[PDB]
RNA sequence: GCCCGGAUAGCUCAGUCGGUAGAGCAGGGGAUUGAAAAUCCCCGUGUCCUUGGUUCGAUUCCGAGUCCGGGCACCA
RNA sequence: AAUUGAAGAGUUUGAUCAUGGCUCAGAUUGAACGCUGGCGGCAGGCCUAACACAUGCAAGUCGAACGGUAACAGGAAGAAGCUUGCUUCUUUGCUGACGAGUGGCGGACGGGUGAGUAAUGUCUGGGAAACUGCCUGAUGGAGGGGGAUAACUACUGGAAACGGUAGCUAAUACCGCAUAACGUCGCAAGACCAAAGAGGGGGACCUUCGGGCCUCUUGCCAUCGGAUGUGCCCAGAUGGGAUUAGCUAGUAGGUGGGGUAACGGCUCACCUAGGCGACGAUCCCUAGCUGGUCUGAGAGGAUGACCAGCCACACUGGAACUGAGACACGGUCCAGACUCCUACGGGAGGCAGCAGUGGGGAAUAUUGCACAAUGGGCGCAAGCCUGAUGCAGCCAUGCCGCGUGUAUGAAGAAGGCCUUCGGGUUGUAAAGUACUUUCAGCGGGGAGGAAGGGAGUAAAGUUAAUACCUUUGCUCAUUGACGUUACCCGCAGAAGAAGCACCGGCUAACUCCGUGCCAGCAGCCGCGGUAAUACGGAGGGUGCAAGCGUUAAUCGGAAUUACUGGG
């Protein structure tokens, strides 16, 4: 239940980086990004209004790697939970375990952070877990289990931790491969590049 | 009854009844083997003894099954089912048969007695059951039958037609 | 059908005739009372009433006839006879 | 009911055993049902490789 | 299980007699139109169930294999 | 904190605004279908034929109710094979227990199904004219006999099913008798009403050395209550049709008797002549009702399948018996149709219980495992039965989860498709390279669901009593259907894990070739007539994902039934 295909092109459908592929190369420069998702990528569609709706949804969902259905489930969560539907939905998606993992710098990509998480490699609150859609509760902790602790991919991926803006809400020590979640991310905290209200409307139709 | 009989490797208990009798296959509603009741899907094997159970006479297990050519085996014993159905519709057909038959029978070829001495030894016929069943199915290749009807040839002046065919 | 519990059936019949017996018995005593009430023989009818009381009530506690039915009889009959005086 | 046979090529003739789905043609002032190609006695459409769910042909093993 | 017959151009149909595969309808072609119809001038159209064998001629002989329409018969 | 939520679009016209229908985006299903298919958690699963059904199981249990013992196990022990104490030949209800039987309780619960049912049901709220085994509080009793049956024999009918006559016998079976009241009846006075035992042990006491006696346990009968269940009565609510308008003679009251556990036309007899009806009687059509489920912002509209309360039915039609309770799903008697047995005289059976066959259908599974869990039945109990239930199997069937790999990788490879042929694109995708190994797979380890219950010991009450017994701690051996459990650890290698729809507008996404109003698509508008973004194919693309489509189905949009909310 993952895209499992040429992940970079998705960046061009959005004609935007989705952080889908970070390992080495800086600017994707192997994509000719934001120019041709397909054979007529050269096209310049006026793109219908509803199209912007569908497009926003696709953006966020591509980002977290979240598939439609579950994403919708999340939407209802953003409905009956409380506060601005959009904001909640955002924070909730941030709450995804794997998203927290990649966000902890562990794993070069969201998907790779998942490659870890499914392999029981991650241990939250001193408890091994496998599922990536895990809802990381407030003030928890997590660390790579010792069996694959700091090994191989890890350190290079955590070396990447510096390249990013390093999140406020979460905590880390790295020596213990720690990931002490605290408060849920604030609306401003996230990327902000997205316009959730659109998606809000989308399902609000 | 201790008797055994060969079958294609992958048959059904229904089919077996046909070796006992075609009508017996149509009587079938219950099947058992070694005291184990089995569905009309069981693929018989290893000379294992049958324990048939029946009642009267109906299209039975193939009513839609073998007709659907799914889990009732063979293109053979099923034929009995096929006709078993058909003779019903055929009866109604034989009647609607005489109907249209009679029309042409005297509209062109004249008489029933004329029509009778026709197909009886002309195109394969068997009995008036079939001959009068002819248009409830078109089995004979009718009109070629009207041709068998108009098979007579006095044609003297008809030669004058062929001459004109050249003219 | 098949149950060693089917025995209940035979046991119930073994009970029916028994039950049935008392019924007709009880009825006749009651009958004589109305018969006596027909006669107008308040005294004799009274006697018959005395010659039914132990029977009906016994059967009541015995479980055949309920008891409210018993009281019913004694009641309305007593009404019949006092009115018969 | 009269009923349409989707796609070109159809072995159906007179009798036979064919399933009927809803829907209608709108072009044949009358037909209001479609035979289920690729199901029952009805044949799967011959030589199809695109959207064969409809028409019911199995995936090309080739 | 045995016995008896049907399969002919795309549809319906002619056939055939062990000898050199047609009629009718649609269909296509040409004129005309943007393309049709009407009208006008042309036309083709098939491994004869398959297959080998008797085949210079089998399509008419022969089964073997096909489906197809009857009939009897296994009633454990 | 416990509701804070309501979107429009295409389409008639040359064009517009109107009105106005049809159609779409959404939500949803006890789904089927097509293609496709990795695993797992959890739910769900015959909506049609209330069609017929082979086979197995679905209700038995109690010796601590009884005479007895058909079996085995032993123990008193006749007699015997010889290792003269090796077993044995064998007799024995005498004990552990228990074939058959009498009796208690259960079978009226549990489980199924929705046919019937438009109210005799159900929902809601009320009420009086009642009954209520098992459970329980209270108070008394629990005396004194007798007569039978079965069992069992004998004989015996009958193919069988299944009885016949003769005697034999017990009981907490049955039936008088005495004794009754806060019991019933009765104005009162008066009258009548019941029943039994069995079990453990234990002194001295006493033996007809059965035992009496004691005390403990329970069973027994009565009566007033509790609770529980049940019958019952009324108001209102509970489909559609007026192209059904009159319907009713136990019908509407009363009286009187009878009947019910109980009110009553519930039923009879006589009397009255009423009763219902436009706020829809009667009739017809359809349907099990509800908590609820569905959708909707709401009000509403549709539905009532799973879980649950109620109701009705148990092959069809009908009746009744037993019993606290049924007019009785795996009871009875009768009629019918039906299936089966027959020695053809005469008998047997009802899956709408769990599974399962066939049948019908678009369509819905295993003739699995288990009493370990709860619950129920019986038994003081230990136990036994339990297709309730608990689990397993079966199918993507719904919901939910995870995986089918991750990082690098430009030479923009090959091949493929477009090219304005110079390229673009496929596309970092691949290869190649470096890693990780959930689940698959293999091999080790392995909670919880387990509480109880049995044996022992101590104590505490119990009494005469150390003891029996009950209560409680303590000790011992134990009880897991699932189950090579869940979960965990090692292991090999990316190894085994991606389809489906769509791509003219609605509506996300374009080109080339083939066909040329043909073949074909289509939900609506429509596309196809030799340059098609719509048909087929390719590439590419979008959406979705072990699903995806299609059809069916309800509501939303539809303020196109408008009460909210229209003319």
UniProtKB/Swiss-Prot annotation, chain A:
Keywords linked to the UniProt accession: Antibiotic resistance, Repressor, Ribonucleoprotein, Ribosomal protein, Ribosome biogenesis, RNA-binding, rRNA-binding, Transcription, Transcription antitermination, Transcription regulation, Transcription termination, Translation regulation
GO BP term, example: transcription antitermination
Cellular component, GO annotation: cytoplasm; cytosol; cytosolic small ribosomal subunit; small ribosomal subunit
InterPro entries in UniProt: Ribosomal_uS4, Ribosomal_uS4_bac-type, Ribosomal_uS4_CS, Ribosomal_uS4_N, S4_RNA-bd, S4_RNA-bd_sf
Pfam families in alphabetical order: Ribosomal_S4, S4
Domain of life per record: Bacteria
Domain S4 RNA-binding: 95-155
Molecular-function GO terms, alphabetical: mRNA 5'-UTR binding; mRNA regulatory element binding translation repressor activity; rRNA binding; structural constituent of ribosome
Its job: One of two assembly initiator proteins for the 30S subunit, it binds directly to 16S rRNA where it nucleates assembly of the body of the 30S subunit.
Subunit field text: Part of the 30S ribosomal subunit. Contacts protein S5. With proteins S3 and S5 encircles the mRNA as it enters the ribosome, which may play a role in mRNA helicase processivity. Some nascent polypeptide chains are able to cross-link to this protein in situ. The rRNA transcription and antitermination complex (rrnTAC) consists of RNAP, NusA, NusB, NusE (rpsJ), NusG, SubB, ribosomal protein S4, DNA and precursor rRNA; S4 is more flexible than other subunits.
UniProtKB/Swiss-Prot annotation, chain B:
Gene field: relA
Disruption phenotype: A slight increase in biofilm formation in a csrA-disrupted background; when combined with a spoT disruption (a ppGpp0 mutant) there is a very large increase in biofilm formation. The ppGpp0 mutant makes decreased levels of CsrA and its inhibitory small RNAs (sRNA) CsrB and CsrC. Deletion of relA alone decreases persister cell formation in a hipA7 mutant; the double relA/spoT deletion obviates persister cell formation.
The protein, known as: GTP pyrophosphokinase
Domain of life of the native organism: Bacteria
Function: In eubacteria ppGpp (guanosine 3'-diphosphate 5'-diphosphate) is a mediator of the stringent response which coordinates a variety of cellular activities in response to changes in nutritional abundance. This enzyme catalyzes the formation of pppGpp which is then hydrolyzed to form ppGpp. The second messengers ppGpp and c-di-GMP together control biofilm formation in response to translational stress; ppGpp represses biofilm formation while c-di-GMP induces it.
Similarity remark: Belongs to the RelA/SpoT family.
Disulfide bonds: none
TGS domain ranges (all copies): 1-54
Boundaries of the shown chain within the full protein: 412 to 578 of 744
From Swiss-Prot, chain C:
Signal peptide location: none
Transcription regulation keyword on record: no
Keyword terms: Ribonucleoprotein, Ribosomal protein, RNA-binding, rRNA-binding
Pfam family, one: Ribosomal_S20p
Gene Ontology annotations for the cellular component aspect, listed alphabetically: cytoplasm; cytosol; cytosolic small ribosomal subunit; small ribosomal subunit
Transmembrane segments: none
Name by which UniProt lists this protein: Small ribosomal subunit protein bS20
UniProtKB/Swiss-Prot annotation, chain D:
Domain of life the protein comes from: Bacteria
Keyword terms, alphabetized: Acetylation, Antibiotic resistance, Methylation, Ribonucleoprotein, Ribosomal protein, RNA-binding, rRNA-binding, tRNA-binding
One GO biological process term: positive regulation of RNA splicing
GO cellular component terms, A-Z: cytoplasm; cytosol; cytosolic small ribosomal subunit; ribosome
DNA-binding among keywords: no
Positions bearing N6-acetyllysine: 46
Positions carrying 3-methylthioaspartic acid: 27
Keyword Acetylation: yes
Molecular function terms, GO-annotated: misfolded RNA binding; rRNA binding; structural constituent of ribosome; tRNA binding
Function: With S4 and S5 plays an important role in translational accuracy. Interacts with and stabilizes bases of the 16S rRNA that are involved in tRNA selection in the A site and with the mRNA backbone. Located at the interface of the 30S and 50S subunits, it traverses the body of the 30S subunit contacting proteins on the other side and probably holding the rRNA structure together. The combined cluster of proteins S8, S12 and S17 appears to hold together the shoulder and platform of the 30S subunit.
Protein family membership: Belongs to the universal ribosomal protein uS12 family.
Misc note: At least 19 substitutions or deletions in 11 codons can promote streptomycin resistance, dependence or pseudodependence; all but one of the streptomycin resistant mutations (K42R) are associated with hyperaccurate translation and thus reduced translational efficiency.
Name of the protein this chain belongs to: Small ribosomal subunit protein uS12
Organism listed in the record: Escherichia coli (strain K12)
Chain's gene name: rpsL
């Amino acid at each position: 239940a993952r895209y499992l295909g040429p992940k970079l092109k998705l960046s061009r459908r959005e004609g935007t980086d989705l952080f889908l592929k970070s390992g080495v190369r800086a600017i994707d420069t192997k994509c000719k990004i934001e120019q041709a998702p397909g054979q007529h990528g050269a096209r310049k569609p006026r793109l219908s209004d509803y199209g912007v709706q569908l497009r926003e949804k696709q953006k966020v969902r591509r980002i977290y790697g979240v598939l439609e259905r579950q994403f919708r489930n999340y939407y209802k969560e953003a409905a009956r939970l409380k506060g601005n539907t959009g904001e909640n939905l955002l924070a909730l998606l941030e709450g995804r375990l794997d998203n927290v993992v990649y966000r902890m710098g562990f794993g070069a990509t969201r998907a790779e952070a998942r490659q870890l998480v499914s392999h029981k490699a991650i241990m939250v609150n001193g408890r091994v877990v496998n599922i990536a859609s895990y809802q990381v509760s407030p003030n928890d902790v997590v660390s790579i289990r010792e069996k694959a602790k700091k090994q191989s991919r890890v350190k290079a991926a955590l070396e990447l931790a510096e390249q990013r803006e390093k999140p406020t809400w979460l905590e880390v020590d790295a020596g213990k491969m720690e990931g002490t979640f605290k408060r849920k991310p604030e609306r401003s905290d996230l990327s902000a590049d997205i316009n959730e209200h659109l998606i809000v409307e989308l399902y609000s139709k | 009854k201790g008797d055994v009989v060969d079958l294609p490797a992958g048959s059904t208990p229904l089919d077996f009844a046909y070796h006992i009798h075609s009508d017996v296959g149509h009587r079938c509603i219950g099947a058992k083997i070694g005291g184990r009741i089995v569905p009309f899907t069981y693929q018989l094997q290893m000379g294992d003894q049958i324990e048939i159970i029946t009642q009267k006479q109906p299209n039975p297990s193939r009513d839609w099954l073998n007709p659907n050519l799914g889990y009732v085996t063979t293109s053979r014993g099923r034929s009995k089912i096929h006709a078993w159905f058909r003779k019903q519709d055929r009866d109604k057909n034989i009647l609607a048969g005489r109907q249209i038959l009679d029309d042409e029978l005297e509209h062109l070829g004249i008489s029933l007695k004329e029509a009778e001495k026709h197909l009886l030894p002309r195109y394969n016929f068997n009995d008036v059951d079939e001959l009068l069943a002819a248009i409830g199915g078109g089995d004979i290749r009718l009109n070629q039958m009207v041709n068998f009807l108009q098979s007579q040839f006095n044609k003297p002046s008809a030669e004058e037609q062929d001459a004109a065919a050249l003219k | 059908n098949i149950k060693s519990a089917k025995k209940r059936a035979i046991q119930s019949e073994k009970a029916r005739k028994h039950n049935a017996s008392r019924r007709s018995m009880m009825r006749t005593f009651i009958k004589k009372v109305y018969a006596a009430i027909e006669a107008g023989d308040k005294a004799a009818a009274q006697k018959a009433f005395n010659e039914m009381q132990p029977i009906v009530d016994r059967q009541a506690a015995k479980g055949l006839i309920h008891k409210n039915k018993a009281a019913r009889h004694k009641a309305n009959l007593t009404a019949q006879i006092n009115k018969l005086a | 009911v009269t009923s349409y046979i989707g796609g070109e090529g159809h072995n159906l003739q007179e009798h036979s055993v064919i399933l009927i789905r809803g829907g209608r043609v709108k072009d044949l002032p009358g037909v209001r049902y479609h035979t289920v190609r690729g199901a029952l006695d009805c044949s799967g459409v011959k030589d199809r490789k695109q959207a064969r769910s409809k028409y019911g042909v199995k995936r090309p093993k080739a």
